[PDB]
Symmetry: C4
């Protein structure tokens, strides 16, 4: 059925495979059997994965205290601390995810009704295409991350650096994957578990934005349904009952958006600050040189992936606001014959409520906020290439 839960659980299950946001019964097709219970496999697997990520974070924390924390070395701190914070706020999200999916399904039942329709791409495929695209570019980003690592490292072995060292898996562990052997012993088994934990951590880092876009698509789907219903009664005389039901469904979607915002404030702030940090870092690294063209394509693919993923996630979140405002223009089309007060309330609502996702009410995710973020990042760069001018 065209439900949000049935559109996420193919990806919620994949996230719980790397133990993201633990819940019991995420594979079930019913959103009421999913619980947060400590007596099963999933909190245990997320706890083991969390201690793995915590040993990673602590080992690199001590390693970069031994080597010195700089703006160039803080990237690992933000990455692993943000993975652990995503784990924590995902546990908190799962504490209400029973209730969150309960209210989501409860308010999305009327959106699978004859008054509404599925235009071209149902929520299933609409979520699946974008989520598989993000997973594809995430696998690509990590793919050419290892590609750059191993080639630059071996095509560096072939020149100096004791050429007799045969490029191998364990050598790649002990050279390109540092901050793990000053605390943990060197071993093939710990090395493959380190690959698994690092791939899982990259999955956390990207699934943060990926999940936020899943939420944004789930809300924008129903808001597009409301706007399409409003457009279907464009040049026709609308009864007061239809306007009342449209207003009630819009109020229910505002309710769901507010509840999701309350449950997701930690995650939205985390992803917004995390994307600000990483995009400002990679734009801080725009006007410099890299070692080989493989590193060039990897870094630029990271740059477009990161900037476009931030832009696409925030544009899908802003699509909630834009889709609520798109029905405003069609409501302004209404003639004097059917005004009936309710349309006035609905127009006032979408004109003054600025219905959109928010961090913690500090900022509302809108196209206006996206442009403000673009300008803020531009100014931050204009001061940062002066910050790091002598280094490059």
């Amino acid at each position: 059925l065209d439900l949000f839960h049935r559109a996420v659980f193919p990806f919620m299950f994949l996230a719980q495979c790397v133990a993201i946001m633990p819940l019991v019964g995420i594979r079930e097709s019913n959103p009421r059997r999913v619980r947060f219970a400590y007596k099963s496999i999933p909190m245990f697997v997320t706890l083991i994965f969390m201690i793995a990520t915590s040993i990673l974070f602590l080992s690199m924390f001590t390693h970069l205290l031994k080597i010195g924390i700089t703006a160039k070395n803080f990237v690992g701190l933000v990455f692993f601390g943000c993975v652990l914070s995503a784990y924590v706020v995902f546990i908190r999200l799962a504490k209400k995810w029973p209730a969150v999916v309960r209210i989501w399904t409860r308010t999305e039942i009327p959106f699978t009704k004859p008054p509404y329709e599925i235009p071209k791409r149902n929520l299933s495929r609409r979520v699946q295409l974008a989520a598989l695209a993000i997973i594809g570019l995430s696998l690509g980003e990590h793919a050419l991350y290892q590609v750059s690592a191993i080639l630059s490292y071996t095509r560096r072995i072939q020149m100096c650096a004791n050429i007799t060292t045969v490029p191998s898996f364990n050598n790649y562990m002990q050279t390109n994957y540092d901050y793990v052997f000053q605390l943990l012993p060197y071993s093939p088994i710990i090395a493959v578990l380190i690959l698994l934990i690092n791939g899982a951590c990259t999955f956390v880092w990207n699934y943060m934005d990926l999940f936020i876009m899943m939420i944004s698509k789930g809300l924008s789907y129903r808001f597009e349904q409301i706007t399409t219903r409003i457009r279907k009664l464009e040049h026709e005389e609308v009864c007061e009952s239809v306007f009342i039901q449209i207003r009630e469904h819009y109020v229910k979607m505002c309710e769901l958006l507010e509840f999701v915002d309350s449950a997701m404030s930690s995650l939205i702030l985390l992803s917004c600050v995390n994307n600000l940090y990483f995009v400002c870092y990679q734009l801080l690294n725009v006007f410099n040189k890299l070692r080989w063209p493989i590193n060039y394509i990897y870094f630029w693919y990271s740059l477009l992936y990161l900037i476009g993923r931030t832009a696409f996630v925030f544009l899908t979140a802003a699509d909630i606001n834009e889709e609520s405002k798109r029905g405003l223009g069609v409501l302004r089309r209404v003639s004097s014959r059917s005004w009936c007060v309710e349309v006035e309330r609905l127009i006032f609502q979408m004109t003054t409520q600025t219905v959109a996702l928010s961090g913690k009410k500090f900022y509302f995710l809108t196209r206006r906020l996206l442009f403000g973020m673009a300008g803020t990042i531009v100014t931050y760069e204009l001061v940062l290439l002066q910050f790091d001018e002598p280094n490059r």
Copy 2:
């Protein structure tokens, strides 16, 4: 007849002469015979002109990779890439320009009616004066661009640089017009075609803003008609029917503005970013020295032309918002005798809809946005003369 299409086709035809925004039948006086069909002369001429501009862009792209892309050398990249992007978004504009002029004419028929009037300058002359002024200052900018080039170059030949080289057309090609002979062979014919393609590209660069101001004038003309109708019933008792028809025409103009904004979002973002780049470059070049006074007058004439054209185009786009808001004050004049709900709706509309052109809803072209742009450019300069402080 006082139509937008009859006010642009004297300039649409001139733009299609240099093959801008190709359409078939642009010379016709009827806006329904204009089509986007691949089987005629105009898409062929714009394709030849587009490959010409593309060879220009690629040749200078390779030339500036050979010489190094800097902030001073990126100007050519932005210029030719923006000419090609204007070509592309103008093709996309022409994909809907049948429909765009259809809706424009359909909603502008009631604006040529006895309830409305032509105050002093009809849309024909109002468009023609400003468009001929922009074409005049564009011809002037390119005129003293060549003036500065050839004099500085020959009055540079008369001092060193192998004075025996007689100043000639082919020499001006092979010295002042670089980035074309490292890919294309040197020839008088390719040289005159290069002059034609460069003049056409400058025409693209200026006709971007020129067309945006044409659109802004076309919308502001009808909005001024609405405001004049509202002012004509200032101290008189207004019937409900007149207010209803005024509200319906205002809603239709908002419809036309929204449709034009959807069809012109690419072009508006292109011109806004392009003007931001060029104005910030020329203001970046305010506090420096040039070689001869002819270069001084050319550069300062470029500076006033660019800044005043950005200001005038964005002020004409903001004239839509200011003209919609000017009727708000006259609507506030209305006594309690004729309020009739409709005036309340209309006041709420022009108070909260911020009717104006937009990039992609990232920003709405208003006088407030113009002042914000002025402040943003001031701050960008305050960091950029620190960026390029040691260079000057």
Copy 3:
């Protein structure tokens, strides 16, 4: 009588003594005999004074081209160009000042009625106190400007610099008053006329803000009367007629504010940009050293005078907005017994019209705008003490 014209003409006459904003009949107590006619004494005296200021501006223009225009030397350019621009926009203001005072008096007649009252300080004394204070601090600023000049110059004569030069008036002319003898011959008569023209130009520079505050006080007086009338009917049952008349007077004051804004847009932009420039200059000169304590007290008295005069003029202009919004709170006090639609219109008006003075609709003079200006000046300083860091 408590009129704006009778409250300004004691200062309009003083401004026309130094030939500011020429009008014929400014001394008359009737605002309809004041005209802009070229056949009398006042346009002749302002023309002579304007050519005097123009010779000053041109002589210093050539002198600072001979010496080099810098940010430190541009102060004279802005000062004299702003005096001449104040002359020009004051001529333009006087072109409508017949009509401006006509509409001002016409809409301020109902404000001298029994429904309104004069609380403590009538418009006469309210204008007179602030205007005499500004004239006093202007005379003080110019007073210690000459004090610093002549002492620092003579107590500089007593050490080196050919001590035999007796400190005299002509010597102060030929040393501390430069940019006048490279074009005009040296003479006691031209020197005393130069003192008169310089004092008049300082009077222009300060009377810009002084006149803007006069306008702001004139509008805020009537807006305070409206707010006091609204507060007088706080806990009483208000008839619909009283609310209608209050709304009509508020609309008439908005009309007068809009007309004055249209007639004063040039002057308001001039004074706002001029104050921005001078305050940013003096704050640019905060963290440096001067020569003697007399120069210290003069410069700091200039600093507090300039900053406090900008703040006070913009706060009086924002007092229009704050006073319109103060009645909003009292209107919110109204019980359900007397709502009568008109109060709803009035509340919507002062909630969404942002009734205030504006430059050219680029910005509305409000306390919010004052705080934004404070932050903008803070950021401009944060980049400017980096601009001029090596100089100090």
Copy 4:
């Protein structure tokens, strides 16, 4: 009884012990016996304490003129000048605190009624927990301030600096507590009074924000009561009388907020500017080194205390706005059966009045303002670590 006055007087009395904001009868349980009378003990004790703080300020003023006022030495100027300014604006606050607590109690009597309720933490305990937490972290901040001082100073005595000097109380006075013996004679008695005056001054500095949060909690308590009453009638048919009484209580709370804002504008601006200065200083001191780990923990505990106290005080002030807006969502839940105009007025009010504390209407303390402050501080740091880059 659950009153604001009975929730502050356990802390008002403690503040008057160090002579903060003098009033006569602050220990009484009735808010009408508290007066501002010059004939008793409290204005005398605050005058003695004020001359003590004034001798401190003047002595350090002369000492830092003798040594040179820098951005690093201006901290003492701002600290003691802000303590004296808090004394002055607290005297002004006490000039109306009779009236302020009169209106506060008068409008908070209906909030102790059966229509309202005390959810978990009454205003007594809600104020007490946060106030004791702030007093605890203030005692902690000053505690490790002395801890860092005396250890670093003695564990500095044990290395060079005439080790024979036995670490003592008088030695700590004459070394770590300077700017007091160049004006006052050295004596154990003046030294213990100096400790008392410095602890009292730190209490002023922290009780500024502590009192502002007390006010914010007092207002947010009643606003939470209003929101809880609105939520209690969520799915029930609400009578018009209940909505009218809710609107009247909301208007009365807006009245109390406006009166408190008028009486507290000086203190709110003082605390906001003071927190801006100190937070920007400590963030200016984030990326540097200190001498010993005790200084490290003291400075970082100061940093979290200062940043979190600014954030918590401004978040409690913004809790007024957020709590007024939280009832807006529940009011949007209301069906068409009971709209009754009054709900429309109330929705318009909390949608457009932006009910919150303000400095002097320059800025309204909201979560939006908190995010704007965060961004402004970020930009200020981005220019300040360039200001002090060569120093660190």
